[PDB]
Design an enzyme around this catalytic site. Structure first.
Site, PDB file in Angstrom:
ATOM      1  N   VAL A  12      60.209  48.269 -66.310  1.00 51.02           N
ATOM      2  CA  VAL A  12      59.468  48.031 -65.054  1.00 51.02           C
ATOM      3  C   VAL A  12      58.221  48.926 -65.072  1.00 51.02           C
ATOM      4  O   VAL A  12      58.369  50.159 -65.289  1.00 51.02           O
ATOM      5  CB  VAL A  12      60.332  48.291 -63.822  1.00 51.02           C
ATOM      6  CG1 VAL A  12      59.566  47.912 -62.576  1.00 51.02           C
ATOM      7  CG2 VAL A  12      61.664  47.554 -63.852  1.00 51.02           C
ATOM      8  N   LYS A  51      58.426  43.639 -63.727  1.00 51.31           N
ATOM      9  CA  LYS A  51      59.666  43.699 -64.504  1.00 51.31           C
ATOM     10  C   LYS A  51      59.454  42.848 -65.757  1.00 51.31           C
ATOM     11  O   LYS A  51      59.279  41.618 -65.603  1.00 51.31           O
ATOM     12  CB  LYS A  51      60.843  43.199 -63.663  1.00 51.31           C
ATOM     13  CG  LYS A  51      62.196  43.297 -64.332  1.00 51.31           C
ATOM     14  CD  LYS A  51      63.289  42.900 -63.341  1.00 51.31           C
ATOM     15  CE  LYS A  51      64.679  43.134 -63.880  1.00 51.31           C
ATOM     16  NZ  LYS A  51      65.671  42.811 -62.813  1.00 51.31           N
ATOM     17  N   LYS A  62      63.192  52.032 -67.230  1.00 49.63           N
ATOM     18  CA  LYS A  62      63.686  51.302 -68.409  1.00 49.63           C
ATOM     19  C   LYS A  62      65.061  50.795 -67.974  1.00 49.63           C
ATOM     20  O   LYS A  62      65.661  51.392 -67.042  1.00 49.63           O
ATOM     21  CB  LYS A  62      63.655  52.266 -69.601  1.00 49.63           C
ATOM     22  CG  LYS A  62      63.256  51.692 -70.955  1.00 49.63           C
ATOM     23  CD  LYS A  62      62.602  52.704 -71.901  1.00 49.63           C
ATOM     24  CE  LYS A  62      63.563  53.589 -72.685  1.00 49.63           C
ATOM     25  NZ  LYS A  62      63.660  53.188 -74.112  1.00 49.63           N
ATOM     26  N   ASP A 104      76.051  44.093 -57.936  1.00 47.49           N
ATOM     27  CA  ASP A 104      75.724  45.412 -58.510  1.00 47.49           C
ATOM     28  C   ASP A 104      75.119  46.319 -57.449  1.00 47.49           C
ATOM     29  O   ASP A 104      74.132  47.019 -57.747  1.00 47.49           O
ATOM     30  CB  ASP A 104      74.842  45.271 -59.751  1.00 47.49           C
ATOM     31  CG  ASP A 104      74.844  46.516 -60.633  1.00 47.49           C
ATOM     32  OD1 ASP A 104      75.826  47.276 -60.525  1.00 47.49           O
ATOM     33  OD2 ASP A 104      73.828  46.723 -61.344  1.00 47.49           O
ATOM     34  N   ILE A 119      57.851  52.768 -64.538  1.00 48.03           N
ATOM     35  CA  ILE A 119      58.716  53.089 -63.370  1.00 48.03           C
ATOM     36  C   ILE A 119      60.139  53.309 -63.878  1.00 48.03           C
ATOM     37  O   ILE A 119      60.836  54.157 -63.331  1.00 48.03           O
ATOM     38  CB  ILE A 119      58.742  51.960 -62.323  1.00 48.03           C
ATOM     39  CG1 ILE A 119      57.403  51.748 -61.628  1.00 48.03           C
ATOM     40  CG2 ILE A 119      59.858  52.231 -61.316  1.00 48.03           C
ATOM     41  CD1 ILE A 119      57.376  50.540 -60.749  1.00 48.03           C
ATOM     42  N   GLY A 170      65.078  45.401 -70.157  1.00 45.26           N
ATOM     43  CA  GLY A 170      63.642  45.600 -70.449  1.00 45.26           C
ATOM     44  C   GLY A 170      63.072  46.788 -69.709  1.00 45.26           C
ATOM     45  O   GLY A 170      63.755  47.843 -69.680  1.00 45.26           O
TER      46      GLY A 170
HETATM   47  N1  QY8 Z   1      59.344  51.419 -57.233  1.00 46.41           N
HETATM   48  C1  QY8 Z   1      59.885  50.230 -57.588  1.00 46.41           C
HETATM   49  N2  QY8 Z   1      59.522  49.111 -56.955  1.00 46.41           N
HETATM   50  C2  QY8 Z   1      60.201  47.995 -57.352  1.00 46.41           C
HETATM   51  N3  QY8 Z   1      60.062  46.745 -56.850  1.00 46.41           N
HETATM   52  C3  QY8 Z   1      60.904  45.902 -57.556  1.00 46.41           C
HETATM   53  C4  QY8 Z   1      61.633  46.587 -58.473  1.00 46.41           C
HETATM   54  C5  QY8 Z   1      61.176  47.926 -58.377  1.00 46.41           C
HETATM   55  C6  QY8 Z   1      61.547  49.117 -59.032  1.00 46.41           C
HETATM   56  O1  QY8 Z   1      62.403  49.193 -59.930  1.00 46.41           O
HETATM   57  N4  QY8 Z   1      60.843  50.245 -58.587  1.00 46.41           N
END
Ligand code: QY8
Length: 337
Positions: free
Chosen positions: A33, A48, A27, A147, A25, A31
């Site tokens: 996701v 994450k 970087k 943030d 999803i 780290g």
């Molecule tokens: N699509 C998405 N869902 C998420 N849930 C928690 C973090 C996160 C993300 O970064 N992308």
């Protein structure tokens, strides 16, 4: 023992006979996701994965403690914050399992070709964000996100207006000073730029900036560095009040106190609009069909609607953090009537 800090994650692998890794999803400095199917719960999750690096492990432990604290609350207002399902160690990395959300508000603006979303959709985002900030202001929480930016506000569903806030990795509680610089530069409050004490009001500053950008398609204050940022803020809002600058540790980074005690902008090495002359009334196009005139001959964009939006945003962009509008009072504004 691996030499790099990152976890090696192969699309299609399965963790602990439970998580089917689909794809990356995102970087980040923390780290990565990954999108994964939780075969036990039969649902998508976002995992994450924290770098094996002391600084990021400490930010992530703060994130876990703050998200778990928020989860104990009964109020429906907690559902504007992304839900942490669980956390575990895997291959020597801290892994946080979140609910899977949709794309972020920056992605939404890109899909408009940066022409902005409707005032009606902006209002729905504003009401939900003000509710989320009221929740964080609960005394037992007293959480400063630190943030807020379009990238940290995610839609729940690509066809609906429901949103959640993500990424409490830089967050703290009222009275803490942990990190030397905080907030993303375009969304950074004057008190942070000035090295003054900060409280929950810095997140309302960021929200004000975000909401203008969601309607215009462009950042309100797009500074290339902290000096350029303060100068773009002064174009719209004028020189900050003397009672603030007289107490600001970093006043002389941007301003100079004249012989009569009045403050002016600092001389450049050797370009901005004069202070307070880039009016938000014109940025929003209150009288002139909204941004670029593009909302004339559309409904939901009246002069009355625009004055209410402008008035709320200018209360969110009060230079004085003590008088800046608080979430409890923002929710009662006529913009939401
Ligand atoms: N699509 C998405 N869902 C998420 N849930 C928690 C973090 C996160 C993300 O970064 N992308």
């Amino acid at each position: 023992v691996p030499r790099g800090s990152h976890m090696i994650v192969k699309n299609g692998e399965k963790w602990m006979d439970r998580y089917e890794i689909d794809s990356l999803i995102g970087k980040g400095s923390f780290g990565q996701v990954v999108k994964a199917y939780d075969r036990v719960e039969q649902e998508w999750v976002a995992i994450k994965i924290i770098k094996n690096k002391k600084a990021f492990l400490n930010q992530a432990q703060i994130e876990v403690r703050l998200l778990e604290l928020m989860n104990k609350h009964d109020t429906e207002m907690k559902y504007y914050i992304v839900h942490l399902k669980r956390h575990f160690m895997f291959r020597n990395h801290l892994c946080l399992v979140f609910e899977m959300l949709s794309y972020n508000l920056y992605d939404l603006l890109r899909n408009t070709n940066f022409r902005g979303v409707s005032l009606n959709l902006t209002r729905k985002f504003a009401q939900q964000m003000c509710t989320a900030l009221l929740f964080l202001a609960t005394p037992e929480l007293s959480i400063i996100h630190c943030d807020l930016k379009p990238e940290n506000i995610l839609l729940c569903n690509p066809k609906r207006s429901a949103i959640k806030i993500v990424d409490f990795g830089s967050s703290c509680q009222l009275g803490q000073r942990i990190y030397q610089y905080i907030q993303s530069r375009f969304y950074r409050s004057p008190e942070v730029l000035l090295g003054m004490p900060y409280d929950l009001a810095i997140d309302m500053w960021s929200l004000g900036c975000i909401l203008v950008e969601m309607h215009t398609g462009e950042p309100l204050f797009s500074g290339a560095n902290e000096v350029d940022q303060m100068n773009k803020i002064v174009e719209v809002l004028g020189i900050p009040p003397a009672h603030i600058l007289d107490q600001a540790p970093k006043a002389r980074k941007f301003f100079e106190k004249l012989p009569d005690g009045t403050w002016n902008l600092k001389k450049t090495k050797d370009e901005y609009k004069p202070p307070g002359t880039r009016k938000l009334h014109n940025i929003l196009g209150v009288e002139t069909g909204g941004p670029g005139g593009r909302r004339a001959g559309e409904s939901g964009h009246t002069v009355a609607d625009y004055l209410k939006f402008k008035d709320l945003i200018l209360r969110m962009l009060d230079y004085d953090p003590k008088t800046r509008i608080q979430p409890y009072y923002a929710l009662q504004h006529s913009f939401f009537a």
